[PDB]
Amino acid sequence: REIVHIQAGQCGNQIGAKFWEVISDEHGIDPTGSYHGDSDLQLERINVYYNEATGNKYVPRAILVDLEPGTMDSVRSGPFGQIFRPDNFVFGQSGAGNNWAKGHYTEGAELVDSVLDVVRKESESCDCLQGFQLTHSLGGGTGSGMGTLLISKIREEYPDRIMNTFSVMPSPKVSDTVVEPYNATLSVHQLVENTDETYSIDNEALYDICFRTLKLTTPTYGDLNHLVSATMSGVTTCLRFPGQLNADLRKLAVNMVPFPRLHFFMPGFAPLTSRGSQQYRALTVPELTQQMFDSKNMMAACDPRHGRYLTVAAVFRGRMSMKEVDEQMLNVQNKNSSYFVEWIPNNVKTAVCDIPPRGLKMSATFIGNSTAIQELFKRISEQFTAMFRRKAFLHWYTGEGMDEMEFTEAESNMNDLVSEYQQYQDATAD
Amino acid sequence: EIVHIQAGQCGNQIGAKFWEVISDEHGIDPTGSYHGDSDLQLERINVYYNEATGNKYVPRAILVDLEPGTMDSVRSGPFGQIFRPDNFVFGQSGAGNNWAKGHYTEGAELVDSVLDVVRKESESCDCLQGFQLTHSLGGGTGSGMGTLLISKIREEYPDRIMNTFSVMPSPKVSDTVVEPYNATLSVHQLVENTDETYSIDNEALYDICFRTLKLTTPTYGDLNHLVSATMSGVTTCLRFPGQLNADLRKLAVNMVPFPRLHFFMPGFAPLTSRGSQQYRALTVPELTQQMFDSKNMMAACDPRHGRYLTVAAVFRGRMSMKEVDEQMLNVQNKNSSYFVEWIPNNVKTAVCDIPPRGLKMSATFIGNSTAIQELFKRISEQFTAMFRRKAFLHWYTGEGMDEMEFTEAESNMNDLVSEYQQYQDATA
Amino acid sequence: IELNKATSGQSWEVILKPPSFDGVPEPSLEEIQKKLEAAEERRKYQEAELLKHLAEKREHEREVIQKAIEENNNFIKMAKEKLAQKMESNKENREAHLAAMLERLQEKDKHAEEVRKNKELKE
Amino acid sequence: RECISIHVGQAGVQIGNACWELYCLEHGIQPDGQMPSDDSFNTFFSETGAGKHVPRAVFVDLEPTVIDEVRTGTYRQLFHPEQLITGKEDAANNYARGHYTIGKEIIDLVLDRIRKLADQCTGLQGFLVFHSFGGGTGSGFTSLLMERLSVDYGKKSKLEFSIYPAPQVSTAVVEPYNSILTTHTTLEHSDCAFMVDNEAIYDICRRNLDIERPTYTNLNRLIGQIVSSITASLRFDGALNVDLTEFQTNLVPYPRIHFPLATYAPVISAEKAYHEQLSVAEITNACFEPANQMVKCDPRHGKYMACCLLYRGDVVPKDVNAAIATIKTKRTIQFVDWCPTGFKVGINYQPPTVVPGGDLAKVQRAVCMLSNTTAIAEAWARLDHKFDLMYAKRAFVHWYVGEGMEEGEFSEAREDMAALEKDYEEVGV
Amino acid sequence: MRECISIHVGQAGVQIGNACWELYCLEHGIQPDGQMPDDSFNTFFSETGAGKHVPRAVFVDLEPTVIDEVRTGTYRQLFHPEQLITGKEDAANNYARGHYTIGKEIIDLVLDRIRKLADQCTGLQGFLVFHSFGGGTGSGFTSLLMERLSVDYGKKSKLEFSIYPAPQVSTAVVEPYNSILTTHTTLEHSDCAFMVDNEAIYDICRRNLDIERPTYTNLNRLIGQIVSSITASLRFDGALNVDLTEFQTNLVPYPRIHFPLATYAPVISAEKAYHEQLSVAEITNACFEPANQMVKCDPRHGKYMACCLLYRGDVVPKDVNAAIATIKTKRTIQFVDWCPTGFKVGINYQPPTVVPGGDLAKVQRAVCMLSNTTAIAEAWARLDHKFDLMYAKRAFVHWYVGEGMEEGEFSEAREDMAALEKDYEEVGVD
Numbered sequence A: 001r002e003i004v005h006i007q008a009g010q011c012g013n014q015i016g017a018k019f020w021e022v023i024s025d026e027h028g029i030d031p032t033g034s035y036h037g038d039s040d041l042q043l044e045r046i047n048v049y050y051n052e053a054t055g056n057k058y059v060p061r062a063i064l065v066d067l068e069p070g071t072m073d074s075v076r077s078g079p080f081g082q083i084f085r086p087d088n089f090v091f092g093q094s095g096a097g098n099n100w101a102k103g104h105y106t107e108g109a110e111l112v113d114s115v116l117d118v119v120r121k122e123s124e125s126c127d128c129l130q131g132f133q134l135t136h137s138l139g140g141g142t143g144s145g146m147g148t149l150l151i152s153k154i155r156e157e158y159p160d161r162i163m164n165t166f167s168v169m170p171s172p173k174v175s176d177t178v179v180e181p182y183n184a185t186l187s188v189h190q191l192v193e194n195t196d197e198t199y200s201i202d203n204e205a206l207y208d209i210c211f212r213t214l215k216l217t218t219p220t221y222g223d224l225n226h227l228v229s230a231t232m233s234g235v236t237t238c239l240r241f242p243g244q245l246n247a248d249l250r251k252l253a254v255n256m257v258p259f260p261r262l263h264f265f266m267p268g269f270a271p272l273t274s275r276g277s278q279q280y281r282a283l284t285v286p287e288l289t290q291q292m293f294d295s296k297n298m299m300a301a302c303d304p305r306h307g308r309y310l311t312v313a314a315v316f317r318g319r320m321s322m323k324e325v326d327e328q329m330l331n332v333q334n335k336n337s338s339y340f341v342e343w344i345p346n347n348v349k350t351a352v353c354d355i356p357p358r359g360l361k362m363s364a365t366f367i368g369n370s371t372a373i374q375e376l377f378k379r380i381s382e383q384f385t386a387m388f389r390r391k392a393f394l395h396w397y398t399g400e401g402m403d404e405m406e407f408t409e410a411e412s413n414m415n416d417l418v419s420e421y422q423q424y425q426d427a428t429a430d
Numbered sequence B: 001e002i003v004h005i006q007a008g009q010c011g012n013q014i015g016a017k018f019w020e021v022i023s024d025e026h027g028i029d030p031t032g033s034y035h036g037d038s039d040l041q042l043e044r045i046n047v048y049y050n051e052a053t054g055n056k057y058v059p060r061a062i063l064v065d066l067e068p069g070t071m072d073s074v075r076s077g078p079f080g081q082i083f084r085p086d087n088f089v090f091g092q093s094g095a096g097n098n099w100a101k102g103h104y105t106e107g108a109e110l111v112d113s114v115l116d117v118v119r120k121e122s123e124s125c126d127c128l129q130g131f132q133l134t135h136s137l138g139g140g141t142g143s144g145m146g147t148l149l150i151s152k153i154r155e156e157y158p159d160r161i162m163n164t165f166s167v168m169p170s171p172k173v174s175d176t177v178v179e180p181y182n183a184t185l186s187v188h189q190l191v192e193n194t195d196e197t198y199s200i201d202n203e204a205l206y207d208i209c210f211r212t213l214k215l216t217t218p219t220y221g222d223l224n225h226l227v228s229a230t231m232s233g234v235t236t237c238l239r240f241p242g243q244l245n246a247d248l249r250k251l252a253v254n255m256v257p258f259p260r261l262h263f264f265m266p267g268f269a270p271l272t273s274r275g276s277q278q279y280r281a282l283t284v285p286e287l288t289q290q291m292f293d294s295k296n297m298m299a300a301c302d303p304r305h306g307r308y309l310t311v312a313a314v315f316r317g318r319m320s321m322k323e324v325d326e327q328m329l330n331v332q333n334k335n336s337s338y339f340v341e342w343i344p345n346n347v348k349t350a351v352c353d354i355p356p357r358g359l360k361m362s363a364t365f366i367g368n369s370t371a372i373q374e375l376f377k378r379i380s381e382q383f384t385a386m387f388r389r390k391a392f393l394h395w396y397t398g399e400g401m402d403e404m405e406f407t408e409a410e411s412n413m414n415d416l417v418s419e420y421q422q423y424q425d426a427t428a
Numbered sequence C: 001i002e003l004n005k006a007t008s009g010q011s012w013e014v015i016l017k018p019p020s021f022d023g024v025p026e027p028s029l030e031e032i033q034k035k036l037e038a039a040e041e042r043r044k045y046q047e048a049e050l051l052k053h054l055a056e057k058r059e060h061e062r063e064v065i066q067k068a069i070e071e072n073n074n075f076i077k078m079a080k081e082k083l084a085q086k087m088e089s090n091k092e093n094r095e096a097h098l099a100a101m102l103e104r105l106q107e108k109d110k111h112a113e114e115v116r117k118n119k120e121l122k123e
Numbered sequence D: 001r002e003c004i005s006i007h008v009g010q011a012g013v014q015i016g017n018a019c020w021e022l023y024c025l026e027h028g029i030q031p032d033g034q035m036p037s038d039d040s041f042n043t044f045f046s047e048t049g050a051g052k053h054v055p056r057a058v059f060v061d062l063e064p065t066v067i068d069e070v071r072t073g074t075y076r077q078l079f080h081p082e083q084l085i086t087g088k089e090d091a092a093n094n095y096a097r098g099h100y101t102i103g104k105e106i107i108d109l110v111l112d113r114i115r116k117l118a119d120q121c122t123g124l125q126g127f128l129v130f131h132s133f134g135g136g137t138g139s140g141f142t143s144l145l146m147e148r149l150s151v152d153y154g155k156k157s158k159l160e161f162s163i164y165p166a167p168q169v170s171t172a173v174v175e176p177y178n179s180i181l182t183t184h185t186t187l188e189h190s191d192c193a194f195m196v197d198n199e200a201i202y203d204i205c206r207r208n209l210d211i212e213r214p215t216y217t218n219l220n221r222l223i224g225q226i227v228s229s230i231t232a233s234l235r236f237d238g239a240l241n242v243d244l245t246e247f248q249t250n251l252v253p254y255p256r257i258h259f260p261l262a263t264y265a266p267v268i269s270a271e272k273a274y275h276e277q278l279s280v281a282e283i284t285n286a287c288f289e290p291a292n293q294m295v296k297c298d299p300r301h302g303k304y305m306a307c308c309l310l311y312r313g314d315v316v317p318k319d320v321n322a323a324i325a326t327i328k329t330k331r332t333i334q335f336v337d338w339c340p341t342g343f344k345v346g347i348n349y350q351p352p353t354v355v356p357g358g359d360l361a362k363v364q365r366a367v368c369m370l371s372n373t374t375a376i377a378e379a380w381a382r383l384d385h386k387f388d389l390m391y392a393k394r395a396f397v398h399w400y401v402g403e404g405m406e407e408g409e410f411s412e413a414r415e416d417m418a419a420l421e422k423d424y425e426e427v428g429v
Numbered sequence E: 001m002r003e004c005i006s007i008h009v010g011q012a013g014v015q016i017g018n019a020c021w022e023l024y025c026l027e028h029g030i031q032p033d034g035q036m037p038d039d040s041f042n043t044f045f046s047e048t049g050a051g052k053h054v055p056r057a058v059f060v061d062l063e064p065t066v067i068d069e070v071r072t073g074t075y076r077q078l079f080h081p082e083q084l085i086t087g088k089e090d091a092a093n094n095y096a097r098g099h100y101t102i103g104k105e106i107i108d109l110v111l112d113r114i115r116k117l118a119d120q121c122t123g124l125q126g127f128l129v130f131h132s133f134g135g136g137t138g139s140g141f142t143s144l145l146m147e148r149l150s151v152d153y154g155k156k157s158k159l160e161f162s163i164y165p166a167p168q169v170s171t172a173v174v175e176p177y178n179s180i181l182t183t184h185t186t187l188e189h190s191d192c193a194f195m196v197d198n199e200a201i202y203d204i205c206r207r208n209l210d211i212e213r214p215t216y217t218n219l220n221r222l223i224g225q226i227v228s229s230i231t232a233s234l235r236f237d238g239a240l241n242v243d244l245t246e247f248q249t250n251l252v253p254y255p256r257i258h259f260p261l262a263t264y265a266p267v268i269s270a271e272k273a274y275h276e277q278l279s280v281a282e283i284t285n286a287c288f289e290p291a292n293q294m295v296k297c298d299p300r301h302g303k304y305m306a307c308c309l310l311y312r313g314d315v316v317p318k319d320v321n322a323a324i325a326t327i328k329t330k331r332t333i334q335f336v337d338w339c340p341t342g343f344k345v346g347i348n349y350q351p352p353t354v355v356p357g358g359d360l361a362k363v364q365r366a367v368c369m370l371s372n373t374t375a376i377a378e379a380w381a382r383l384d385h386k387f388d389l390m391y392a393k394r395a396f397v398h399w400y401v402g403e404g405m406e407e408g409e410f411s412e413a414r415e416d417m418a419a420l421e422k423d424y425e426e427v428g429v430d
């Protein structure tokens, strides 16, 4: 039934707030929380992400968390901001100084129990808790440290529930913080063991999209978050809207995740639009199909043609022909047959939603479990290794009480994940 | 005095038809009241019908079924009113074409209940002759329960005689696969418990209807019509006062040379079609050869394959007894290879001046031929096909049975064929 | 020749040729009832043997109806017992799965405490 | 002087119905028992306080049907409820059943009606047992009764009236078993048995009376004539065969060979036009032709050992010997060495009585012959072969053994029947 | 008397039950309130003191949705609220949840209601279980229930209506696992099972009803006709024939060989025009066309062990026999040497009835051919191979194991299937 949301850190809260702007609009809710939309479907599954409040108002089941008041203030002073329950804003003033150990161990831990009290409150309000969803940065402190800390601490209390994340991968193309690969690597390990599914939002892809495609010379975060949000409404459509399913996180997980350690998804979207720009002419069903399955439309900088799809789930939005859809969908896999594992029969599922997003007469979301994701992990390991080899910036970590072993362990666990991805990539049915 | 039991769908339909044909031949209307012409009818009425004063005539018939279906057919039927309401003994769990169900599990739960009725009906007899079972050998009730009733009765009335009307299953009429399993189990019981067994063959009843009666789509009505005719014909000497003047025990002692060899080949002349059309009389030699020919035997055997141990033949109506005697002696002279020499004067005639209903001249054969082993070889083969592969046995082992009980029943019936064999090859 | 004369009757011999030869020749109730009784003993004993086999058949009928009853109860026992072991081994299995995954987390919870401890030592 | 007519089985009963029907005619008795206006008739009738003369007869049958037919007919008054004994179920064509099974059951009670019939006797001459040969009732029980009659009333004569089986007549497949089995038992106990081959009577009712398909009634019309022509001199004041012990002498030289051949004349029909009524020479010549023989066998190829010529009605002794003198002139008619070549003629002056409104016709003159011939074994050979075929293959035996008998007895019966067959060989030299 | 209880597990089972029970009302002039203006139908509907005719049915599901659509549906009054059972959390397309984890929490409440329907049975014939092969509820819960009823009701007759998974008709990646585990667990507890290949019901709706993309309603309606046609011999009593349980004796030679193949005919579009009508010989021959098979298989290439024809409408023995003759000449109907070649026939008075505003046209006369062919074993092999592909690499296996299952429960289940496959080879031997 219902989902509890947690946004952590700067990026976490940044992409989180926008998800709430996107989906509240999609559900016919104004910044106060009063429903003022046409369709009865916008409410049919509204309880998934919202709480029914007094005065017939709706309030997001979301917990705002950070170690700096900064972004939480940006959010509050922001558009919907007054929409969230202000008790859920679990904030500290310390800061995490882009240090995993300040988040996971030192500073983070002091706030962690105050956060859990609020998550336990939202879990009690629930009729049937489905699982949890975290939006977080993997290169910072709060998102990477306190994020993974919360995942683990929640996991202790709700081992029965689905732990799903929107993890945003750091690229040097977007951020100068040298220690980001350290923080990335440490967080990936926590994910590989504590999350049922993770959507890999990679700032390398995000930047390259806004630049090479949307031709914005100096892309801001607002420009990148626009893609994150477009994707998020997409990846959560069947979760929110009534269709030909049913509508569950566990159901998605059981089908999309064949091997437990391998729950890292490559999101992708079609069409790619500029932040707040009016759409002119809509795309045909083949255009949507072709685009969606293209490297240039992927939310993670990995070439799907360099690996193999274990599982694929594709969600089409807007009023279109399912026979056209079913024709197109089967063409793709019949021509790209080599990029789909033969040992997972009928691994490409398709959901169609008659409700399109704002300003798009037709959308298409892609969720793939391609072995190609190793490319991203490798990219991080190389980035980590370079610095680790020289024991670079380590006293920022050892100064928080950490160990050089914890670091070597983390590298090793990353390396194993890549080898695991490669094994099934190379695996043949004969 | 004879006590009549009818078991299963087949047995109750067969039985209902005997009871209505004979009701007309005795002048007893569907209510149970004498309206007949000659007092010759009521002379030997005490064999089948009882009194109520009345005068009301109730048939000495006990009705048994493991489901109500058939019982209600009778009840709702024309002559169905004549039966003692307190004589309908039935269950609700049909045994469903399973000998092991009717014979053990389901049947046993209704046997004692039936026996009480026979006990009652036998007490109201000055002296009883024996018993009359009408049943199918391929079903569950008649096949299994009917054989169970015979066994139980044999224990209560050992001295009283066991006469049965046993209809033989054929793949022509009825598609149930298991029929051979039932019949072989049924036959095994009849070999040991009855005294006289009238082997009515559905293979033959169908072929007669088809090839000869020219009935393109033969129904049970048409099949049963021949059976009712023959039943009245084989009971002509019992229910009718003539020079004979005999019974069940006398019939058995004279028809049955050896114990086990008690399965008879019923016959009939002329082969009448349902309702349509009658017209034109038959000569005595036309009647004789018809009746003595395979195209008239209610059993699927060629009599020219074996040898008749003993023959019985009841002629009906106004005919020259001279003419009758004349043709019989001529027949025995011509086909002397197919009659046993070592049993002298083994062909027995009978005449009765009252002609049957509609047709004004009849002939009813009863042969105890070694040829009958052909009806058994058939049954045994159909059994063996399924049995060598242990097919459909689960339905039987589920009812408590063992594979041994099947292995024996076949063995015992194969031994019966080897027994009929001995006298087919034997001379003087 | 003469024999006798009477009221409503008479008689007389009549020889036609003499005989060639002058010479001529060339029960107990105790034992009938002993033999009558003898036949009755036999008839009564073979009927008693017939009675033996008929009652031996009653036994068979009692055996099979019992086999069917026992076969169903052994079946119900097996079904019930297999399911008991199935539902338990399951509970047993799944429980250790969760108890171990909580231990793995509690072990990681141990680690965090020592990092906070290692930072204190460093001051 | 008293004489008990015992009637066992369906034949012996129906046969006993015909005879007492004829006696009541010949003596002038009514079916009520009383008679209006020569004392020798009383050798068969016991008078009551009501002047009614009740027959000295006991009817035995193991099924009610036949005896119940007596208690129905006009002659219902003639007899007492005690003298018409009926069981429940008959022997069902089974000798062994009639003897050991249903026999034992009714024996004592059967002897009581005889006892009480004999407790009314000055001195019983003997008993006349009527019965069939191949009936289960008219074989098994008769033989059982003869066993006890030979004990309980020993030394008193026994005159058997047996009905020999025939295919032309209502015969049963088991009859040859019953026939030999009964003869084996009823051999030592009979003193003189008069066989009646049903085949012979059948032809007689055809060729002469002109009845193609004769009824039992019509066949019994002649059996009463002949049986009455046998008993004639006992019921009247005659000279030839004045007692039962006379036949044992007059016809039985060798004791086992006690089966004389009967013969009667004239066989006459009423539905045929009037003519010149037959002479003594007419009916004496006829008496020798096998056309009127009571039993079917070749007398021409058989060595004789006795002869009688029992006449009736309007005869003259000269005319009688006038026919004897004419037959020895043409035919030889052989005789055994140890036996004298000659008759024992006797004339019972009483007239030939025929049933008023019957098949038979009123005749002034009538004759019957009693002739013991080795030729009578030609019918025992018929029976002995039929027995030998079935018994060879044991066909039907199980039924007899089922009633308590033994295969031991089946052979004992045939061995004795082969020994009796040799007695006709030792004699017919 | 002769009472029959229908149990409907999961989404497929329930939705079919609705198609079934709707038709049943129409079939028996019954109104959706329970009232109605041959007493043989009482075997399926119990009657009350008020005169209402309540079905002898139990509707079960681990999640509420599907059942709630009936509790609010046009037939909210047709059933008892007690007899429509629901859980809160579903089986997440996982047998192990349906069976153990989640089913354990409902089973006793389910069995208790079956007991209360069992009481209203003067003499129960047995149970009819409608379920999917691939649902977590359809697989797990059904097998638990079957096992449980075999203790509760011992050897009492248990019949099945199992929906065989097809790619075109939804399906999920784990469905082979679900279908193989369920076959194995139910195999003993089942006395007879009627397989329904969703592809075939898809193909028929496409080729005959001319529906380009058929709905669940469309399929379920077609299915209901076949199912009703099979059960006609129990809700009706005609002199003509009508006689299940008898078919069942000929159909099942051995206990494991209890899977008849239905070959329903005629399927006619409700917009066919001149159409009226088809002879017995048309409809009989139709049964021998693979295009009409309930399961996609090749019995022209497989030996026969039984053949049953179930006529309904305006059928007369003349043409039936005349038809049977025309077929019985042709050499493609090859029976084995151990069983006869006769065709068991049954005939009804009541013609097939049509649904208000239906996809199908109204036929004067319809037939359903149940047969025991070694060609049904292909459906097993088809499924087994798909299972074999994933199991080889133990794909998705962890979701099962995580719920308390053992790897062996998959070996055992597969070995049993290979035995069932070997057993169908062995049986066709002459």
Ligand SMILES: CC[C@H](C)[C@@H]([C@@H](CC(=O)N1CCC[C@H]1[C@H](OC)[C@@H](C)C(=O)N[C@@H](Cc1ccccc1)C(=O)O)OC)N(C)C(=O)[C@@H](NC(=O)C(C)(C)NC)C(C)C
Binding pocket: B009, B013, B171, B172, B173, B174, B175, B217, B218, B219, B220, B221, B222, E239, E240, E316, E317, E318, E320, E321, E324, E342, E343, E345
């Ligand atoms: C080969 C034997 C079969 C089974 C018969 C017969 C059944 C019958 O007579 N039946 C089936 C119910 C009753 C009966 C029939 O049809 C209403 C009426 C008129 C009748 O004879 N009734 C009796 C009473 C009765 C009722 C129930 C049972 C027996 C008798 C009467 O009114 O006098 O159908 C004509 N038949 C040729 C057939 O055509 C059947 N075909 C077969 O069984 C084949 C395929 C030929 N077997 C290898 C089928 C297509 C109906």
Ligand SMILES: Nc1nc2c(ncn2[C@@H]2O[C@H](COP(=O)(O)OP(=O)(O)OP(=O)(O)O)[C@@H](O)[C@H]2O)c(=O)[nH]1
Binding pocket: D008, D009, D010, D011, D012, D014, D015, D061, D062, D063, D066, D090, D091, D092, D093, D132, D133, D134, D135, D136, D137, D138, D139, D163, D164, D165, D166, D169, D170, D171, D172, D198, D216, D219, D220
């Ligand atoms: N002449 C003659 N022979 C008879 C008569 N009744 C029967 N028979 C013959 O007797 C033989 C059979 O014996 P039955 O006396 O009839 O039978 P039963 O066993 O003695 O007596 P039941 O048991 O009452 O039939 C056959 O050869 C018949 O032809 C009759 O009235 N007259």
Ligand SMILES: Nc1nc2c(ncn2[C@@H]2O[C@H](COP(=O)(O)OP(=O)(O)OP(=O)(O)O)[C@@H](O)[C@H]2O)c(=O)[nH]1
Binding pocket: A246, E009, E010, E011, E012, E013, E015, E016, E061, E062, E063, E066, E090, E091, E092, E093, E132, E133, E134, E135, E136, E137, E138, E139, E163, E164, E165, E166, E169, E170, E171, E172, E175, E198, E201, E216, E219, E220
């Ligand atoms: N023919 C048909 N197939 C269906 C229907 N509903 C689901 N299916 C099939 O059932 C399978 C999935 O199983 P479900 O019954 O939906 O799932 P469930 O676990 O039993 O039930 P839920 O927990 O409600 O999802 C797939 O193979 C579908 O094709 C239906 O109404 N008709």
Ligand SMILES: COc1cc2c(c(OC)c1OC)-c1ccc(OC)c(=O)cc1[C@@H](NC(C)=O)CC2
Binding pocket: B234, B237, B238, B244, B246, B247, B248, B250, B251, B252, B254, B255, B310, B311, B312, B313, B314, B346, B347, B348, B349, B350, B366, D170, D171, D172, D173, D174
């Ligand atoms: C109750 O009905 C009958 C009873 C019997 C017989 C019989 O066939 C004519 C019947 O009619 C069917 C009978 C049978 C067979 C015989 O030999 C084959 C025989 O010798 C003798 C007979 C019968 N006796 C006579 C003289 O026919 C006695 C038993």
Ligand SMILES: Nc1nc2c(ncn2[C@@H]2O[C@H](COP(=O)(O)OP(=O)(O)O)[C@@H](O)[C@H]2O)c(=O)[nH]1
Binding pocket: A008, A009, A010, A011, A012, A014, A015, A096, A097, A098, A137, A138, A139, A140, A141, A142, A143, A144, A168, A169, A170, A171, A174, A175, A180, A203, A206, A221, A224, A225, A228
């Ligand atoms: N797309 C996106 N990336 C962001 C945003 N804010 C920070 N980042 C990324 O997050 C990483 C650092 O995490 P950050 O959120 O600053 O640290 P935290 O506040 O301590 O969790 C870098 O790689 C940045 O690229 C944002 O709003 N959007």
Ligand SMILES: Nc1nc2c(ncn2[C@@H]2O[C@H](COP(=O)(O)OP(=O)(O)O)[C@@H](O)[C@H]2O)c(=O)[nH]1
Binding pocket: B007, B008, B009, B010, B011, B013, B014, B094, B095, B096, B097, B098, B102, B136, B137, B138, B139, B140, B141, B142, B143, B167, B168, B169, B170, B173, B174, B179, B202, B205, B220, B223, B224
């Ligand atoms: N001749 C004839 N055979 C019948 C009749 N009814 C059924 N049968 C046959 O009986 C056999 C099966 O026995 P049945 O009467 O159905 O079963 P039961 O009720 O369990 O004794 C088959 O060979 C059928 O062809 C009928 O009335 N007449």
Ligand SMILES: [Mg+2]
Binding pocket: D090, D091, D092, D093, D094, D135, D136, D137, D138
């Ligand atoms: Mg007798």
Ligand SMILES: [Mg+2]
Binding pocket: E090, E091, E092, E093, E094, E135, E136, E137, E138
């Ligand atoms: Mg499910």
